[PDB]
Amino acid sequence: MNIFEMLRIDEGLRLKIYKDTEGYYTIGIGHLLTKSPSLNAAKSELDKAIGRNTNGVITKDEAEKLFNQDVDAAVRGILRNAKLKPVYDSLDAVRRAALINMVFQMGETGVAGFTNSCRMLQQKRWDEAAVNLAKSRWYNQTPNRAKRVITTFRTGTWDAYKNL
Ligand SMILES: *SCC1=CC(C)(C)N(O)C1(C)C
Ligand SMILES: [Cl-]
Ligand SMILES: [Cl-]
Ligand SMILES: [Cl-]
Ligand SMILES: [K+]
């Protein structure tokens, strides 16, 4: 298990445009295209991202290329966030993957709340952080994924994924 395998489990793989859990046009391994309700806008985003006329369908290799870029993006963005880099750098590599997972799902900027959860993680108060992370829209709207990510923070193991 590693961040790529972890996110592949949590995001799935679909080769045609679909709507994510929030209703937003997405493709591949959780590649958000746009928040616009226009399918035509989503197809323009897709064609721009792949560099060809796709009409909303891609190959597995193309999906994996966007995924590689999106993981790389998430990591770089954590480092570029002065509010988050210290937390990331304080963690072991397994818990770092849990943090990347959250940023991938929620965004590299603009995420609301979670200051207290990040403090408890920096303090290495793992059970307390896990309780605090669940007091969230995130946990209520995507509870099975959030439970897996939270277990990863609580334990520093891959137990919630190994077997999936
Ligand atoms: S560690 C909690 C946290 C704080 C913030 C910077 C808002 N992040 O996006 C997450 C959710 C990772
Ligand atoms: Cl565009
Ligand atoms: Cl709490
Ligand atoms: Cl879920
Ligand atoms: K998804």
Coordinates of C-alpha atoms and ligand atoms in Angstrom, one line a residue:
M1 CA 0.0 0.0 0.0
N2 CA 1.0 3.6 -0.9
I3 CA -0.8 6.9 -1.7
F4 CA -1.5 5.8 -5.3
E5 CA -3.1 2.5 -4.3
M6 CA -4.9 4.2 -1.4
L7 CA -6.5 6.9 -3.6
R8 CA -7.2 4.3 -6.3
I9 CA -9.4 2.4 -3.8
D10 CA -11.1 5.6 -2.5
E11 CA -11.7 7.3 -5.9
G12 CA -12.3 4.3 -8.2
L13 CA -11.6 4.3 -11.9
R14 CA -14.1 5.4 -14.6
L15 CA -13.2 6.1 -18.2
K16 CA -16.3 8.2 -19.1
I17 CA -17.4 11.5 -17.5
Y18 CA -19.5 10.9 -14.4
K19 CA -20.7 12.8 -11.4
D20 CA -18.8 12.5 -8.1
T21 CA -20.3 12.3 -4.7
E22 CA -21.0 16.0 -4.7
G23 CA -22.7 15.9 -8.2
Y24 CA -19.6 17.4 -10.0
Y25 CA -18.3 16.2 -13.4
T26 CA -15.3 14.0 -12.9
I27 CA -13.3 11.4 -14.8
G28 CA -10.6 8.8 -14.3
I29 CA -9.3 8.3 -10.7
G30 CA -11.2 11.2 -9.0
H31 CA -10.1 13.9 -11.5
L32 CA -12.5 16.7 -10.9
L33 CA -13.2 18.5 -14.2
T34 CA -15.4 21.5 -13.1
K35 CA -18.0 22.5 -10.6
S36 CA -20.1 23.9 -13.5
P37 CA -23.4 22.1 -14.2
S38 CA -22.6 22.4 -18.0
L39 CA -21.5 19.0 -19.5
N40 CA -20.1 21.0 -22.4
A41 CA -17.9 23.0 -19.9
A42 CA -16.7 19.7 -18.4
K43 CA -15.9 18.3 -21.9
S44 CA -13.8 21.4 -22.6
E45 CA -11.9 20.9 -19.4
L46 CA -11.3 17.3 -20.2
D47 CA -10.1 18.0 -23.8
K48 CA -7.7 20.7 -22.4
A49 CA -6.4 18.3 -19.7
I50 CA -5.7 15.4 -22.2
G51 CA -4.8 17.6 -25.2
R52 CA -7.2 16.1 -27.7
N53 CA -10.8 15.9 -28.6
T54 CA -12.2 13.3 -26.2
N55 CA -16.0 13.8 -26.3
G56 CA -16.0 12.7 -22.6
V57 CA -14.1 9.3 -22.9
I58 CA -10.4 8.5 -22.1
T59 CA -8.1 5.5 -21.9
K60 CA -6.8 3.9 -18.7
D61 CA -3.3 5.3 -19.5
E62 CA -4.7 8.8 -19.8
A63 CA -6.6 8.4 -16.5
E64 CA -3.4 7.3 -14.8
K65 CA -1.5 10.3 -16.2
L66 CA -4.0 12.7 -14.8
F67 CA -3.9 10.8 -11.5
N68 CA -0.1 11.0 -11.3
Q69 CA -0.3 14.8 -11.9
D70 CA -3.1 15.2 -9.4
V71 CA -1.2 13.4 -6.6
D72 CA 2.0 15.4 -7.4
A73 CA -0.2 18.5 -7.3
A74 CA -1.7 17.6 -3.9
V75 CA 1.8 17.1 -2.3
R76 CA 3.1 20.3 -3.8
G77 CA 0.3 22.2 -2.6
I78 CA 0.7 20.9 1.0
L79 CA 4.2 22.1 1.0
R80 CA 3.2 25.5 -0.4
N81 CA 0.6 25.9 2.5
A82 CA 2.4 27.4 5.5
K83 CA -0.7 26.2 7.7
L84 CA -0.2 22.6 6.7
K85 CA 3.5 22.0 5.8
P86 CA 4.6 21.8 9.4
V87 CA 1.9 19.2 10.1
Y88 CA 2.9 17.2 7.1
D89 CA 6.5 17.3 8.0
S90 CA 5.8 16.1 11.5
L91 CA 4.1 12.9 10.3
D92 CA 5.4 9.5 9.4
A93 CA 4.9 8.4 5.7
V94 CA 1.7 6.4 6.4
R95 CA 0.0 9.4 8.1
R96 CA 1.4 11.7 5.4
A97 CA -0.6 9.6 2.9
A98 CA -3.8 10.1 4.9
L99 CA -3.2 13.9 4.8
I100 CA -2.5 13.8 1.0
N101 CA -5.8 11.8 0.6
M102 CA -7.8 14.6 2.4
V103 CA -6.2 17.3 0.3
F104 CA -6.9 15.4 -2.9
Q105 CA -10.6 15.1 -1.9
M106 CA -11.1 18.5 -0.4
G107 CA -8.7 20.8 -2.3
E108 CA -5.2 22.4 -2.0
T109 CA -6.7 25.8 -1.0
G110 CA -10.0 27.1 0.3
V111 CA -10.8 24.3 2.8
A112 CA -12.8 25.4 5.7
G113 CA -12.2 24.4 9.3
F114 CA -10.0 21.5 10.5
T115 CA -7.5 23.8 12.4
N116 CA -8.1 21.9 15.6
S117 CA -7.7 18.5 13.9
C118 CA -4.4 19.5 12.4
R119 CA -3.2 20.7 15.8
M120 CA -4.0 17.4 17.4
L121 CA -2.2 15.6 14.6
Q122 CA 0.9 17.8 15.1
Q123 CA 0.7 17.0 18.9
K124 CA 0.5 13.2 18.1
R125 CA -2.7 12.9 20.1
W126 CA -3.9 10.2 17.7
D127 CA -7.2 9.1 19.3
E128 CA -8.2 12.7 20.1
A129 CA -7.4 13.8 16.5
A130 CA -9.5 10.9 15.2
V131 CA -12.5 11.9 17.3
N132 CA -12.1 15.5 16.2
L133 CA -11.8 14.7 12.5
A134 CA -15.2 12.9 12.6
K135 CA -17.0 16.1 13.7
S136 CA -17.2 17.2 10.1
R137 CA -19.3 17.5 7.0
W138 CA -16.7 15.3 5.4
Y139 CA -17.4 12.4 7.8
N140 CA -21.1 12.7 7.5
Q141 CA -21.2 12.9 3.7
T142 CA -18.5 10.2 2.9
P143 CA -18.4 8.2 6.2
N144 CA -16.8 5.0 4.9
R145 CA -13.9 6.8 3.2
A146 CA -13.5 9.2 6.2
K147 CA -13.4 6.2 8.6
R148 CA -10.6 4.6 6.5
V149 CA -8.6 7.9 6.4
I150 CA -9.2 8.5 10.2
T151 CA -8.1 4.9 11.0
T152 CA -4.9 5.6 9.1
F153 CA -4.3 8.7 11.2
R154 CA -5.2 6.9 14.4
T155 CA -3.0 3.9 13.9
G156 CA -0.3 4.8 11.4
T157 CA -1.0 1.5 9.7
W158 CA -2.7 0.5 6.5
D159 CA -5.2 -1.7 8.3
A160 CA -8.2 0.1 6.8
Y161 CA -7.0 -0.6 3.2
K162 CA -5.1 -3.8 3.2
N163 CA -7.7 -6.4 2.1
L164 CA -9.4 -3.9 -0.2
Ligands
LIG1 S1 -4.9 18.4 9.2 C1 -6.5 19.2 8.7 C2 -6.6 20.1 7.5 C3 -6.4 21.4 7.6 C4 -6.5 22.1 6.2 C5 -5.3 22.9 5.8 C6 -7.7 22.9 6.2 N1 -6.5 20.9 5.4 O1 -7.0 21.0 4.1 C7 -6.8 19.6 6.1 C8 -8.2 19.1 6.0 C9 -5.9 18.6 5.6
CL2 CL -11.4 24.9 -20.9
CL3 CL -12.9 16.8 19.7
CL4 CL -17.9 7.0 1.8
K5 K -14.8 9.2 -7.2

